């Protein structure tokens, strides 16, 4: 426990945890999404995950940076459904643009005709801070550079 | 909201002027001496390239 | 008013490389009037289809029949009384890229890539049949199975 | 040593109000209700009773921490109908449903015992 | 925007177990009913133990822990007794607590089994559950030791104690839990695909199934909502299971009415 | 040392089902038939009787401190 306000301000302005995200050792983040959080990130951002209105409205209570404007569903008829990518897009703030590959991305898919439309949903692409393509993994939400 | 299939209004001479102004304003070693200028391009050679 | 595209499609190949997702089917389709090519990911459990089916597909920019744009945020009021009543499958997405001529090629062919919340469409064909398509434009899929 | 008393999960302290209503400023006709010393029971019933109302647009509860016995509901309704009135209507409908279930269960117990 | 119309059908009722089906109600209501049967249903259990002679082989708090877990017959009593915090009394009024006594001294060479039959009660309606067991004179089972064994004593050891039993619910402590396992199940044929079987042929069929032998899952119905719930409430002997269900619904109604009263109280601001 | 009053996961009263369990074991039964005859159908209560060891019978062999 610091015992003075100048030491308190030094803890605030230097030592605090969000200021210590990037290592100067290897210009990479030191903190990453780990364990079942990472496992359920991979299990949520799959293509087949369809989430009903009730579950989305429960899940949006845990996002304090939400602007209280509900996104329009991926499917409007007959039942309104959201996808896992459509609610991960709410988590990602600001203008964030990124292209990476999932760990099971085949090597011959990039030279094929299905480069920008993945049969296996393995080309991760985020445009304008909302997730568009791909299944996230350690390569996208880990300690690796350019994540 | 840049449309990449529509004609643009950016002349290349303004691109050259903006790049030159940006590289003149992106300094590391300050001063106007020969040593200071030479150390400035030696510090910013890879960034300028 | 607001209908960017409208055609009747025949399904000619369903999951050609194997079914990779449980609730998502991939349809390869060819049209009848305008010789288009379609790759579309649909919800398999919610709207099942078989090979050789015919379906009417309408790509619109709004559900309002007078052509005025929508509010952009979901409410569970206005999905009836509109152009979506005549269709059994309504989806919502946006274009993330348009391939084809780019800048240094002829405009004989054109491809448009749409991401409905993670589900993917590639619609390709003649460039004059894809007027009004642009990147980061939101759009509606309307889809009804024919007999 | 630091074990909290076991009766703090259901008993209010001195001067602790049960319901703390907070008006939302991001959108219109939205409220955040904070109920102390309760759990997922009341929150689950009230939310799934609120979602049967067509006049509500958003309804969701959250327990912010398992160690703090407290839960919140965000309710956003249309512009003719207060969220507090929606919370009244949900509680009243749950009470009516539970009373109907209680009398039906008493009738079923009576006929099962008398029928042999 | 209105309430449901819950219909109940009881498939089995006995002295310690009820099996019934809820029809046309939401899943939150059924899960909250299960939670209020486990946690917030009140019963009587021993809470105040004072020892005057503990010359046995077990400690004071171990014996207090073993005595406090003993279920007590509290069907006709718990709705009239108040909590200790809600009485004007201080020294444990009879409308606040139930007095129990025990005084066993072993003077024989064989092992003396101190059970719940030695736990005398000042109230004639609050007894341990073995009042249901001592009346079985048709004992072809072969063993008369049907009572909860509190402790064993050898010669020269004695146990004298005075205890007070209070009213409480299982949220405060698990000794006030009236049930012994509430089985709760909806959609036994997996017609809603709420859970995903990698191999549906590897799973045994539920007792409430409707499928024949060569089928393993019902066809998928995306329009289906959970409105049929199978409940099996088993009592631990403290309360009758129908009394467990009735008092659980009454506690839920009291909680909702208290929330309504507090909301209407804060509404005038 | 002694049999618990209640099952841990389950809450079913098992304090009256230890001497009967020992008598059924010594009569002629196996453990499974004894647990079925006692009525403990769930294995959560059957692990409370199969795994239990009675250390109070060893503690009772020692002479008491006070006569
Ligand atoms: Zn009292
Ligand atoms: Zn058990």
Swiss-Prot record, chain A:
Disulfide bonds: none
Subcellular location: Nucleus
Post-translational modification: The tandem 7 residues repeats in the C-terminal domain (CTD) can be highly phosphorylated. The phosphorylation activates Pol II. Phosphorylation occurs mainly at residues 'Ser-2' and 'Ser-5' of the heptapeptide repeat. The phosphorylation state is believed to result from the balanced action of site-specific CTD kinases and phosphatase, and a 'CTD code' that specifies the position of Pol II within the transcription cycle has been proposed.
Other known facts: The binding of ribonucleoside triphosphate to the RNA polymerase II transcribing complex probably involves a two-step mechanism. The initial binding seems to occur at the entry (E) site and involves a magnesium ion temporarily coordinated by three conserved aspartate residues of the two largest RNA Pol II subunits. The ribonucleoside triphosphate is transferred by a rotation to the nucleotide addition (A) site for pairing with the template DNA. The catalytic A site involves three conserved aspartate residues of the RNA Pol II largest subunit which permanently coordinate a second magnesium ion.
Function, in words: DNA-dependent RNA polymerase catalyzes the transcription of DNA into RNA using the four ribonucleoside triphosphates as substrates. Largest and catalytic component of RNA polymerase II which synthesizes mRNA precursors and many functional non-coding RNAs. Forms the polymerase active center together with the second largest subunit. Pol II is the central component of the basal RNA polymerase II transcription machinery. It is composed of mobile elements that move relative to each other.
Family classification: Belongs to the RNA polymerase beta' chain family.
Name of the featured protein: DNA-directed RNA polymerase II subunit RPB1
Encoding gene (name): Polr2A
Residues of the full protein shown: 497 to 643 of 1887
Swiss-Prot record, chain D:
Transmembrane parts of this sequence: none
Gene Ontology annotations for the cellular component aspect, listed alphabetically: RNA polymerase II, core complex
Localization per Swiss-Prot or TrEMBL: Nucleus
UniProt xrefs under Pfam families: RNA_pol_L_2 (PF13656)
CDD domains according to UniProt: RNAP_II_RPB11
Keyword Transcription carried by entry: yes
PROSITE patterns, sorted: RNA_POL_L_13KD
InterPro entries to which the protein is assigned, alphabetical: RBP11, RBP11-like, RBP11-like_dimer, RNA_pol_Rpb11_13-16kDa_CS, Rpo11-like
Family, per entry: Belongs to the archaeal Rpo11/eukaryotic RPB11/RPC19 RNA polymerase subunit family.
Subunit structure of this chain's protein: Component of the RNA polymerase II (Pol II) complex consisting of 12 subunits.
Function (record text): DNA-dependent RNA polymerase catalyzes the transcription of DNA into RNA using the four ribonucleoside triphosphates as substrates. Component of RNA polymerase II which synthesizes mRNA precursors and many functional non-coding RNAs. Pol II is the central component of the basal RNA polymerase II transcription machinery. It is composed of mobile elements that move relative to each other. RPB11 is part of the core element with the central large cleft.
Name of this protein: DNA-directed RNA polymerase II subunit RPB11
Natural source organism: Drosophila melanogaster
Gene, per the UniProt record: Polr2J
Swiss-Prot record, chain F:
GO molecular function: DNA binding; DNA-directed RNA polymerase activity; zinc ion binding
Keywords for the protein's UniProt record, in alphabetical order: DNA-directed RNA polymerase, Metal-binding, Nucleus, Transcription, Zinc
Protein's GO biological process: transcription by RNA polymerase I; transcription by RNA polymerase II; tRNA transcription by RNA polymerase III
Species name: Drosophila melanogaster (Fruit fly)
Cited function: DNA-dependent RNA polymerase catalyzes the transcription of DNA into RNA using the four ribonucleoside triphosphates as substrates. Common component of RNA polymerases I, II and III which synthesize ribosomal RNA precursors, mRNA precursors and many functional non-coding RNAs, and a small RNAs, such as 5S rRNA and tRNAs, respectively. Pol II is the central component of the basal RNA polymerase II transcription machinery. Pols are composed of mobile elements that move relative to each other. In Pol II, Polr2L is part of the core element with the central large cleft.
Matching Pfam families: RNA_pol_N (PF01194)
Gene3D superfamilies, per database record: Homeodomain-like (1.10.10.60)
A Gene Ontology cellular-component term: RNA polymerase I complex
InterPro entries reported in the protein's UniProt record: RNA_pol_su_RPB10, RNA_pol_suN_Zn-BS, RPABC5/Rpb10
Subcellular location: Nucleus
Family statement: Belongs to the archaeal Rpo10/eukaryotic RPB10 RNA polymerase subunit family.
Gene: Polr2L
Subunit structure: Component of the RNA polymerase I (Pol I), RNA polymerase II (Pol II) and RNA polymerase III (Pol III) complexes consisting of at least 13, 12 and 17 subunits, respectively.
Top-level taxon in the UniProt lineage: Eukaryota
Residues binding Zn(2+), per UniProt: 7, 10, 44-45
UniProt entry tagged with the keyword Isomerase: no
Protein name per Swiss-Prot or TrEMBL: DNA-directed RNA polymerases I, II, and III subunit RPABC5
């Amino acid at each position: 426990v610091p015992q003075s306000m100048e030491t308190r301000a030094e803890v605030e302005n230097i030592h605090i945890t969000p200021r210590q995200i990037i290592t100067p050792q290897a210009n990479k983040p030191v903190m990453g999404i780990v364990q079942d959080t990472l496992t359920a990130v991979r299990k949520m951002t799959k293509r087949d995950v369809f989430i009903t209105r009730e579950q989305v409205m429960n899940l949006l209570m845990f996002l304090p940076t939400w602007d209280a404007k509900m996104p329009q569903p991926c499917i409007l008829k007959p039942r309104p459904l959201w996808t896992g990518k459509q609610i991960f897009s709410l988590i990602i703030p600001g203008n964030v643009n990124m292209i990476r590959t999932h760990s099971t991305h085949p090597d011959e898919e990039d030279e094929g005709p299905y480069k920008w439309i993945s049969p296996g949903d393995t080309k991760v692409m985020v445009e304008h801070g909302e997730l568009i393509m791909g299944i996230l993994c350690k390569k996208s939400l880990g300690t690796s550079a350019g994540s | 909201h840049i449309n990449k299939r529509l004609p643009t209004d950016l002349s290349p001479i303004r691109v050259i002027k903006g790049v030159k102004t940006l590289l003149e304003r992106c300094v590391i070693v300050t001063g106007n001496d020969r040593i200071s200028k030479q150390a400035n391009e030696n510090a910013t050679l890879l960034f300028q390239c | 008013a607001g209908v960017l595209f409208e055609d009747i499609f025949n399904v000619k190949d369903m999951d050609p490389e194997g079914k990779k997702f449980d609730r998502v089917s991939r349809l390869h389709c060819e049209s009848e009037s305008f010789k288009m090519d379609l790759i579309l990911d649909i919800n398999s459990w919610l709207y099942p289809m078989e090979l050789g089916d015919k379906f009417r597909l309408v790509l619109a920019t709004t559900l309002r029949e007078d052509g005025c744009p929508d509010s952009g945020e979901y409410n569970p009021m206005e999905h009836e009384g509109t152009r979506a009543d005549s269709f059994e499958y309504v989806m919502y997405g946006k274009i993330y890229r348009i391939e084809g001529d780019e800048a240094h090629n002829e405009a004989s062919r054109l491809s448009a890539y749409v991401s409905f919340g993670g589900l993917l469409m590639r619609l390709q064909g003649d460039a004059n049949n894809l007027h009004g398509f642009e990147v980061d434009q939101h759009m509606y899929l309307l889809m009804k199975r024919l007999a | 040593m630091n074990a909290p008393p076991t009766f703090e999960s259901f008993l209010l302290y001195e001067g602790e109000k049960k319901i703390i209503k907070e008006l939302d400023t991001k959108v219109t006709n939205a409220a955040i209700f904070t109920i102390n010393k309760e759990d997922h029971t009341l929150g689950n019933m009230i939310r799934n009773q609120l979602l049967k109302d067509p006049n509500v647009l958003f309804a969701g509860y959250k327990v912010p921490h398992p160690l703090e016995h407290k839960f919140v509901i965000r309710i956003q309704t249309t512009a003719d109908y207060s969220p507090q009135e929606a919370f009244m209507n949900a509680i009243t409908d749950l009470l009516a449903e539970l009373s109907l279930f209680e009398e039906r269960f008493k009738d079923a117990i009576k006929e099962k015992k008398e029928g042999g | 925007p209105y309430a449901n119309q819950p219909s109940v059908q009881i498939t089995e009722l006995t002295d310690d177990n009820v099996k019934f089906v809820l029809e046309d109600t939401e899943l939150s209501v059924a899960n909250s009913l299960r939670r209020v049967f486990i946690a917030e249903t009140p019963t009587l259990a021993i809470d105040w133990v004072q020892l005057e002679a503990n010359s046995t082989v077990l400690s004071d708090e171990f014996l207090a822990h073993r005595i406090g877990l003993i279920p007590l017959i509290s069907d006709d009593v718990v709705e009239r007794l108040q909590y200790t915090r809600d009485c004007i009394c201080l020294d444990f009024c009879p409308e606040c607590s139930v007095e129990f006594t025990l005084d066993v001294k072993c003077s024989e060479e064989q092992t003396r089994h101190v059970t719940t039959a030695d736990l005398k009660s000042s109230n004639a309606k609050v007894l341990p559950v073995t009042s249901r067991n001592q009346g079985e004179e048709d004992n072809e089972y072969g063993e008369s030791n049907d009572e909860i064994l509190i402790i064993k004593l050898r010669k020269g050891q004695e146990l004298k104690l005075r205890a007070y039993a209070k009213k409480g619910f299982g949220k405060e402590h698990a000794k006030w839990n009236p049930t012994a396992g509430v089985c709760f199940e909806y959609d036994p044929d997996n017609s809603m695909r709420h859970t995903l079987y990698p191999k549906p042929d590897e799973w045994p069929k539920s007792e409430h199934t409707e499928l024949e032998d060569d089928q393993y899952e019902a066809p998928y119905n995306w329009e289906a909502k959970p409105n049929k719930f199978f409940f099996n409430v088993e009592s631990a002997g403290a309360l009758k299971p129908e009394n467990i269900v009735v008092m659980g619904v009454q506690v839920l109604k009291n909680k909702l009415s208290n929330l309504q009263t507090q909301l209407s109280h804060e509404s005038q601001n | 040392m002694i049999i618990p009053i209640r099952c841990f996961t389950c809450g079913k009263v098992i304090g009256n089902k230890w001497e009967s369990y020992l008598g059924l074991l010594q009569a002629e039964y196996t453990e499974g038939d004894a647990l079925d005859a006692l009525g403990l159908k769930r294995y959560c209560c059957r692990r409370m009787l199969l795994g239990h060891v009675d250390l109070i019978e060893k503690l009772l062999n020692y002479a008491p401190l006070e006569k």
